[model samples]
Target: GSSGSSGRSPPSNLALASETPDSLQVSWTPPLGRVLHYWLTYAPASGLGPEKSVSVPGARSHVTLPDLQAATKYRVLVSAIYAAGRSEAVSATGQTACPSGPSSG
Candidate 1:
């Protein structure tokens, strides 16, 4: 949802990069003010439960997620957590680099 009152807006220009065989790097612009931190959640789009989360500092605009399986699609959601609220989520579908090595899916 959208909030008013010169409040913080959700992150924009979100981009995902397949940095390696098993890593995904996410980058986004930090929204204005009182936004204390970021929460990025990703999970296999098909499998159930066991989602992974990353907490990024408010001053950092990027983070790399490691140990993800290549070529496996995942649902990702990033949110800007303000001191008083949460922004509307920015989401995307991203996968790691294709097949370098594999075992447990």
Candidate 2:
């Protein structure tokens, strides 16, 4: 078990910025050096719905995931990408707004 230099540290201080009816906004403390990009993913808890992945620039510390199913639970994960490779993941949980019943007049 050996390698040159160890990989970069993962992002920290994870916090969710916003929770809209159909989307979520999130951010974290950014890591340093050679940070190429970031990876974020979301999937429904039942593991039946489509799983989504997002890529963002390193200088940025936050992102928004939209077009999600309202009222459905989703699992989210975030990771920093570096020249050395990708850093360990940081995760969070969120859910979209529950479906509203049809209009009854």
Candidate 3:
């Protein structure tokens, strides 16, 4: 009950897009081998709140994370999920957009 591969290969070119104050867009390239799914986790850089994660299909390379704090930095991790297990997660960081200002003196 063994094979040449462990089915754990990290993705590449992880990208984060924070256009809105409470949402972030994540994208990346699929790994070189077979994958069952993608596990994406994110949390506030401040480390004050609990971390959050999501599961994405192997066929898809992107996802949108919502309910983030505005103007706050978040630690992100992307990993390839295989039947064997999850790959070593790739890391990234991104900040959410700030609320628009009404007036400036």
Question: Each candidate's TM vs. the true structure?
Answer: 0.81, 0.75, 0.82
Report lDDT (CA) for all predictions: 0.80, 0.75, 0.83
Residues 4-39, candidate 1: write the lDDT tens digits.
Answer: 766868888888888786788888888667678888
Ranking by lDDT: 3, 1, 2
lDDT for each residue of candidate 3 in 16-56, tens digit (9 for 90 to 100)? 88988888888998877888888888888678888889888
Clashing pairs in 1: none
Which residue ranges in model 1 land beyond 4 Å of their true spot? 1-5, 47-49, 101-105
Q: Give, for candidate 3, the lowest lDDT window spanning 10 residues.
A: 1-10
* Candidate 3 residue-wise lDDT at 3: 52
Candidate 3: misplaced stretches above 4 Å?
1-7, 101-105
Task: Give the clashing pairs for model 2.
Answer: 71-96, 71-97, 71-98
Top TM-score model: 3
Q: Model 2, range 1-105, lDDT digits (tens) per residue? A: 365455587888877644666777778888666788888886776777777898888888888888776766667788888776887787777656665566976
